[PDB]
Ligand binder design. Structure first.
Ligand SMILES: Nc1ccccc1C(=O)CC(=O)O
Ligand SMILES: [Fe+3]
Ligand SMILES: [Fe+3]
Length: 301
C-alpha cells in the first residue's frame, strides 16, 4: 500500500528503517557527521540492526542520540548490546523509563522476554550493564535540539505503560508514537488497542495527541511509517478503536461471559501479527491484562 511504508531502508530524505519492520529501529540523519536512533527493539536483532546501521553510517562514533519511547522489552532490548559499539551515543528516555533500568526485577523481566526470542545456538554480543547505560533523562514538554534541522518535542503519553513518551518533529509533522495508539492492523487498516497500564491515561494521551498540528507521518513502535489520512487521523482513530473494544467487552460481560472468551477471540483475531517477536503466551496474556484493565474502569458494579 502507498499510505504505509513498510520496507527496510530509506523512508524519507533524513530517515531510514533498520532491522525488521515488525520491531524497527529508525535512523535519523542529523547532519553530515551526526545521526540519531529512535526506538530500541529486541536484543536478538543486535547484529541485524548493527549491520544495517553500518550500511548507512560509515563511522558509528557519529551516532549521538538514541531516543526511547518506553521500558517494554521490545523497545529497549538492543541498548546493552549496541551501546558498547556506539561510543558517543546518549540514550534519551523519560525519568520513569530510566528508573526501570535501575531496577533488578524490571531488568530481569526484560532479559527473560528477550532471551526467549533467541534462535537456538544464537549468542548475544558483549553488553553494557543496564545500570551503566549512557542515559540522559528527558522531561515532558522538553525540546530535543538534535541537529540544525531536527528539533523534537517530548510528550508524555502514559496508558500503554506508566512511563511511555512520544517524540514530535513539528517541522516534518512527524510523530514517533511508540505503542500509544496501539498496534496497527495491516490486514484491515485500523488500530488495535494496547492498554496495558491505565485506560483513562491512554485515552487522555490520545486526546492530547489529537490536538497536535496535523500529522504527515506517524511512526508507531511496530509496522513502519504511516502517512496521508492514516497519519492525520491516527490519534482520533486509535481513541475510537479503544472505545469500540470497551463497548465490546461490556456487551459480552452483560451476556454473562468471562473475560477469557473475549481474550481468546482477541488472541485468535490479533495474535498472528506479532507472533515472531511476542514469545509463547504473552499475546494472550496481554489481551487478558488489557481486558482486566478495561473491565475495572468501565464495568458498572
Ligand atoms: N505489539 C503488541 C501486540 C500485542 C501485545 C503486545 C504488543 C507489544 O508491542 C508489546 C508492548 O510493547 O507492549
Ligand atoms: Fe509497549
Ligand atoms: Fe511494543
Amino acid at each position: 500500500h502507498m499510505l504505509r511504508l513498510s520496507a527496510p531502508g530509506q523512508l524519507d530524505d533524513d530517515l531510514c528503517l533498520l532491522g525488521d519492520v515488525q520491531v524497527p529501529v529508525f535512523l535519523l540523519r542529523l547532519g553530515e557527521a551526526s545521526w540519531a536512533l529512535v526506538e530500541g527493539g529486541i536484543s536478538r536483532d543486535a547484529e541485524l540492526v548493527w549491520a544495517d546501521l553500518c550500511r548507512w553510517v560509515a563511522d558509528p562514533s557519529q551516532v549521538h542520540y538514541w531516543l526511547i519511547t518506553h521500558k517494554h522489552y521490545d523497545h529497549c532490548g538492543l541498548l546493552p548490546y549496541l551501546c558498547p559499539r556506539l561510543p558517543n551515543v546518549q540514550v534519551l528516555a523519560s525519568e520513569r523509563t530510566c528508573q526501570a533500568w535501575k531496577s533488578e526485577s524490571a531488568v530481569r523481566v526484560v532479559e527473560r522476554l528477550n532471551r526467549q526470542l533467541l534462535r537456538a545456538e544464537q549468542r548475544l554480543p558483549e553488553a553494557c550493564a543496564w545500570d551503566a547505560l549512557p542515559v540522559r533523562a528527558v522531561a515532558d514538554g522538553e525540546w530535543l535540539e538534535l541537529g540544525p534541522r531536527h528539533r523534537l518535542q517530548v510528550i508524555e503519553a502514559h496508558g500503554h505503560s506508566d512511563d511511555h513518551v512520544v517524540f514530535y518533529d513539528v517541522r516534518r509533522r512527524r510523530l514517533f508514537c511508540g505503542d500509544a495508539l496501539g498496534e496497527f492492523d495491516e490486514a484491515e487498516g485500523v488500530w488495535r488497542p494496547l492498554v496495558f497500564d491505565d485506560m483513562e491515561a491512554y485515552l487522555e494521551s490520545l486526546e492530547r495527541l489529537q490536538r497536535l498540528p496535523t500529522l504527515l507521518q506517524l511512526i508507531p513502535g511496530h509496522g513502519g511509517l504511516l502517512r496521508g489520512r492514516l497519519a492525520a487521523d491516527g490519534a482520533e482513530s486509535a481513541y475510537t478503536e479503544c472505545l469500540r473494544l470497551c463497548r465490546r467487552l461490556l456487551w459480552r460481560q452483560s451476556m454473562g461471559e468471562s473475560l477469557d472468551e473475549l481474550s481468546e477471540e482477541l488472541h485468535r483475531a490479533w495474535g498472528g501479527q506479532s507472533v515472531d517477536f511476542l514469545p509463547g503466551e504473552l499475546h494472550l496474556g496481554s489481551m487478558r491484562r488489557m481486558l482486566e484493565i478495561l473491565s475495572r474502569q468501565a464495568l458498572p458494579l
